[PDB]
Amino acid sequence: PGIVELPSLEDLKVQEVKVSSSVLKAAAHHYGAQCDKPNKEFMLCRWEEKDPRRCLE
Amino acid sequence: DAPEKNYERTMAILQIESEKAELRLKELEVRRLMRAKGDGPWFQYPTIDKALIDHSPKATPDN
Asked: N or C end of chain A, less CB within 10 A?
């Protein structure tokens, strides 16, 4: 059939939030309250178009 | 009975039977074409209804 599409490795590179799971769990409620807008935009788009290749930015 | 009565009775009988015979042949050909192509109301084997599909947002996006 069709050749499957995949973004290049330069499109996937990003600075990483390099912390343990305890750091995330401790400040989970503050992170959820303060950063709701880009998280919810990403969640809406990711649930809407059902594609991780179109949900990278 | 009169010969005219038997004559016209025979003509009515022949017309009725010719109509029935042509309808029987049409029924056979209709059945064959309907079974071959499948588009008519006959030979419509049921498939899965689409009202049994859950269209809510699920717990995983890739679906």
From this structure: N
